[PDB]
Request: fold
Amino acid sequence: GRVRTKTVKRASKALIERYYPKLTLDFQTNKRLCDEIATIQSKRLRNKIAGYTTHLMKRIQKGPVRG
Amino acid sequence: PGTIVLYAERVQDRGLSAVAQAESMKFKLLNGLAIRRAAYGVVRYVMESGAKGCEVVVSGKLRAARAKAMKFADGFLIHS
Amino acid sequence: AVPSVQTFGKKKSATAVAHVKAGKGLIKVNGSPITLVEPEILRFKVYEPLLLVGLDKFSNIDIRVRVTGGGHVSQVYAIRQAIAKGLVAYHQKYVDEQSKNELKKAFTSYDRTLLIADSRRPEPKKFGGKGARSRFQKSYR
Amino acid sequence: GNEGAIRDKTAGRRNNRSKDVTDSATTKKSNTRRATDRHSRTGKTDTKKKVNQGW
Amino acid sequence: SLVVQEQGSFQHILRLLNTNVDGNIKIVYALTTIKGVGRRYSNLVCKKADVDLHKRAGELTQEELERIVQIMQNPTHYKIPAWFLNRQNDITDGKDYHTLANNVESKLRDDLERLKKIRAHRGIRHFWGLRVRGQHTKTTGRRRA
Amino acid sequence: AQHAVILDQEKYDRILKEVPTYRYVSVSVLVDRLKIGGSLARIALRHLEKEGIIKPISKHSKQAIYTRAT
Amino acid sequence: FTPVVLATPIPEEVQQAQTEIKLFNKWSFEEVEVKDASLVDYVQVRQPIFVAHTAGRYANKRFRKAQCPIIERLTNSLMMNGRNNGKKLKAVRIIKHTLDIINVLTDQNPIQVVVDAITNTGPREDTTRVGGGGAARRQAVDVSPLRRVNQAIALLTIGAREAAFRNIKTIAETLAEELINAAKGSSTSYAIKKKDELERVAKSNR
Amino acid sequence: TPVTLAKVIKVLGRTGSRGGVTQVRVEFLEDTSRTIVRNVKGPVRENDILVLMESEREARRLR
Amino acid sequence: VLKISTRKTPNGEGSKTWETYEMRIHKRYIDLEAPVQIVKRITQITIEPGVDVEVVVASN
Amino acid sequence: PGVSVRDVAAQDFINAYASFLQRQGKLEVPGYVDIVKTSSGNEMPPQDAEGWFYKRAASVARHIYMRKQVGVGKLNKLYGGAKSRGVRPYKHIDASGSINRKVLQALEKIGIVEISPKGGRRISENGQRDLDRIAAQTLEEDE
RNA sequence: UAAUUGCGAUAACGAACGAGACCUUAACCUACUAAAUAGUGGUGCUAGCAUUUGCUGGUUAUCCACUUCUUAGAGGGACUAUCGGUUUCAAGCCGAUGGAAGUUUGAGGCAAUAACAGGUCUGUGAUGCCCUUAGACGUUCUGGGCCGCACGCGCGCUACACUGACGGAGCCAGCGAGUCUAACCUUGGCCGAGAGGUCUUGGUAAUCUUGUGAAACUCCGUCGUGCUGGGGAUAGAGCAUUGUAAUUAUUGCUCUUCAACGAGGAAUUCCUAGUAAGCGCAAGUCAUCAGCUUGCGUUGAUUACGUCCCUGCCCUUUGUACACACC
Ligand SMILES: [Mg+2]
Ligand SMILES: [Mg+2]
Ligand SMILES: [Mg+2]
Ligand SMILES: [Mg+2]
Ligand SMILES: [Mg+2]
Ligand SMILES: [Mg+2]
Ligand SMILES: [Mg+2]
Ligand SMILES: [Mg+2]
Ligand SMILES: [Mg+2]
Ligand SMILES: [Mg+2]
Ligand SMILES: [Mg+2]
Ligand SMILES: [Mg+2]
Ligand SMILES: [Mg+2]
Ligand SMILES: [Mg+2]
Ligand SMILES: [Mg+2]
Ligand SMILES: [Mg+2]
Ligand SMILES: [Mg+2]
Ligand SMILES: [Mg+2]
Ligand SMILES: [Mg+2]
Ligand SMILES: [Mg+2]
Ligand SMILES: [Mg+2]
Ligand SMILES: [Mg+2]
Ligand SMILES: [Mg+2]
Ligand SMILES: [Mg+2]
Ligand SMILES: [Mg+2]
Ligand SMILES: [Mg+2]
Ligand SMILES: [Mg+2]
Ligand SMILES: [Mg+2]
Ligand SMILES: [Mg+2]
Ligand SMILES: [Mg+2]
Ligand SMILES: [Mg+2]
Ligand SMILES: [Mg+2]
Ligand SMILES: [Mg+2]
Ligand SMILES: [Mg+2]
Reply:
């Protein structure tokens, strides 16, 4: 079962909150962004974060999202 | 002779030293203290030495025949 | 120095290395022709790439393969993988792209992993059974 | 001694084979005591003063 | 091998060493229904006798059978090693025998008796109808006697 | 014991006049034709191939297989 | 077929059938059709194969089992009863032999005959042990195609093995006997019997 | 004998106490425009083909 | 990799749980052509707790 | 074309060489052959009876051709298989060092193998010669 | 959702322990740094076969170059990515493509709060109290015993054969481990049917044993359904190994003896992919003894991808005169 933990979803929230221009429905670059722009300690957790923030963006593009 | 050498060396704050603080409880109790006084003191002192958190367990038997244990934590710890 | 590539193939723990150089068309395994091989039933499995992609194809090239590891079936899959991978690696540096991609096409299409290594592997046993999932046996009382 | 042991009838296999088997052979576990496990036998009890002095 | 023929020649069932032996079995094994002739013994004896093991008990000349016996009961003479033998180093005359047929029963009797007569634990143990080679006797063999 | 371990001349001729129509012949089939056990029946397999009837279409231990001659 | 050769050379029939048609041990995959609508989709045949061996990942998903070539499913199901678990080389060879045998009798692509005994053995309907209260009656069900193929293979090989046990007839021979008797359904096969009976009771309880 | 072929069009769910049975709406083939609900025995997906042994009769629950 | 594989219990009761410790041993070699002076210098220093440094010589 | 044995499948080769060494008449057959087993791990002696020493000879030879050097130990380990310890699990067991050692000594006296340095037994150059030769012969029956 | 994992609902808002993160191991790097304790290509010295180039080897250094394969440091890599279905268009779930890899990537390590009169005083020079303390319950020495056998129960090994046993022949792993003030891992040479013996030898080890040429397995034969050549219990005689000692037979070998067992009632265990099952090996124990364990690789499936029927457990709601808490 692939459901994202709080810390991940929380981080996507905050990032999109404060860095929406930059970020872009592409994981590959949102990733690199996350590196340059926030401080995480595992590649894995950072990726998980990026990929979810990428999802969240990708669906904001078509109407707002709560939170 | 002389192919082995010993040096002593004070430790930077015994406060973040499990081993020191255990030995300290040992001594507090052995030196006839109280139970909660001893433990709460060790803890308050570890905390005061700027730790993120700490926990002291006393297990076994005091004065009453039946055995008991007690957790004495303060601050913050992670377990896994 | 003539044109030449090296490749390999891998099923379970067996690994099969291929040296694919410019030649008059040999196809040998360890030190014998690819006609010997036996397993035998499985023999066609190692012919398989050649016939998928036309027997000609190997006339500008010498092919040699050496497998260590795994066991009998294990080694057959590894060697075949190494050979097809080989041929494609060679069309990629010497022939033209379109040819190579036509070969990847006919392998990848029919397939049996020929170009891509099977990731299946041993799972470790864990105390309480003779196997990995197998648990021992209980009676209750 | 060994002369004894071979010469002694009332010994060897046939003789056992012909005897009935006791019922305590086919017995059961026993158990004895368990729903007393939580029930202290010591009859002693502690006491709130001694416990409060201790802990 | 080859499509064969013969006539009345081969007679089914034939009797050697005071026992009986079926025809229509591959001879080497026929010899086995005698006591004291495990598959090896039979094999080597037949090879020593100069016989075609491809034959049944079936065929075989009378002569052939005779030789077979001769060697069977005089192994040491017709160069059979002696480590090949069920009774080396007697325990009285110390010769090496390959005791055969109705006689191996006797020899067992003899040995067991010697043990019993000397009061040796192995003997007592035999007399008692128990296991003698030291195996635990709590759990195994209870169907028994 | 229950029979088919020799050759009884009548049996041989029987083998020669019974082996057509046998689209399948093998060790098993020969036994099934109420005769030759898998010893001498194997010999029969080798010796119908001496010349004639049986056409070898498969190979080995356990499995043999032949068809009527043409 | 235009022969060609190089250093270490490749045998005649080998070159021949190899490059041309893509056929079996050496049997046709073209022609060969599934005489019962449905079952197509659950009996493979094309893509064609050389021998029924494959490092197949046919388990990790619910239905992809279907996509595994039928003949290889049969051989797979051959290699059981403890002693034989694993032992696919054994099985595969037993199949090569079986197909040769089946071919001998009545022609047909023997792989077509196999296809037929498979079509002809899956129960069109069956039963399950519904409660309905302690004394459990039996509710007739119509069974899936997938279950039909599965159970067909199961039955065929079981009966073939049980037959083959303790007699001179060899596995491939009795497997071919079951296959043949079943391909055009003849109540002398263990399989056809078991199907017919399953459906007898399944009628009997609707 | 009258065979009747029907195509699974919708998978409804599992019935049976044990829960290995599956309720399905099928559109029979030799003349659509008519639907019936049967109970399976095997694993089933959208577009499979059942041989309804008897053409008109249908179930629901299963304990 | 040195494995030691032991029962967790000091006694016998309980489902039979097993546990397995390891000590990982890492080994390396660097070959160097030099005179006496630099070897002696470089090897008296570079000293380190936990790292076992051995210097040999020769070609046999 | 040119030839080795590696160009010839195990069985028909080793049987070709069996029949050869056989024919030849030069050999050495210890004498204990026929009365002997091949390994403690076995039940019955070989079925080839007269021969099989030629079979192992061939086999051994080809095995040594196909590599640097090999000793008696490695052959025992090779020629050995599973022994039923009856009712207690099977275990691999080495075969007899007599059979093998004697075989080596035989092929050597016949100059088809030679005590190697490094250890063991290296194929002889005249071994190379004669083996490549019958290999060739075996592909020649197949023509 | 595997998860008090999240979405959402919302008198709550925002957090911390635990789950997750983290760590280890298995997977991917013709990118980085390298290597006679790992290997490849060229070259020389050289063998054999063809001869027209060729093909297959020998040669811990005769030199040159390399790092694909092996080793282990540093990095990189995946985030359920892209697309599409489905869902309160939420968290998610599903399918397709790509991919070394998309079941928490596979498998483990760590692991909160609380509970139990669970097991351990026979691991401890951890320990309270009781007992005992010279006709010892201290200790050591000799010898026996834990193995004793009408029989009940559990874990196992080997089988009932023809997908097989036997016999030639083919012939391929991975995880380990090994001798200093000592006798450990052992190649090679001889002798021996075997077990083993004997003379030498390499290794404190990526260097030597050892490519641990393992077993199942593959191939050509023999046997042919017969308790059979399936099976190898029991037993007799002889030979060797460990050990001060082998009797109640440590173990190994040879010959011989050739049992039950013809697929196992009621019941009941285990398991979803390199898994199950088959198969061997190394390590622990160890003077000698594995039918045990712990790991390892080899061969490699059938069947689900669901449910609450059985069982077990957690959760709500509910009752309580229980709270030492239904013992
Ligand atoms: Mg945490
Ligand atoms: Mg395993
Ligand atoms: Mg006998
Ligand atoms: Mg071997
Ligand atoms: Mg062998
Ligand atoms: Mg959990
Ligand atoms: Mg030239
Ligand atoms: Mg030239
Ligand atoms: Mg590299
Ligand atoms: Mg894909
Ligand atoms: Mg991981
Ligand atoms: Mg208790
Ligand atoms: Mg303790
Ligand atoms: Mg005490
Ligand atoms: Mg201890
Ligand atoms: Mg302690
Ligand atoms: Mg005492
Ligand atoms: Mg005991
Ligand atoms: Mg019990
Ligand atoms: Mg247990
Ligand atoms: Mg064999
Ligand atoms: Mg001697
Ligand atoms: Mg030395
Ligand atoms: Mg290795
Ligand atoms: Mg019987
Ligand atoms: Mg046997
Ligand atoms: Mg004793
Ligand atoms: Mg005793
Ligand atoms: Mg018998
Ligand atoms: Mg059974
Ligand atoms: Mg002992
Ligand atoms: Mg051991
Ligand atoms: Mg134990
Ligand atoms: Mg009330």
Summary: The interface with chain J takes residues 39-40, 43-44, 47, 53, 80-81, 84 of chain E (CB under 8 Å). Chain E is about 30% helix and 0% strand. The first helix of chain E runs from residue 39 to 49. The radius of gyration of chain E is 20 Å.
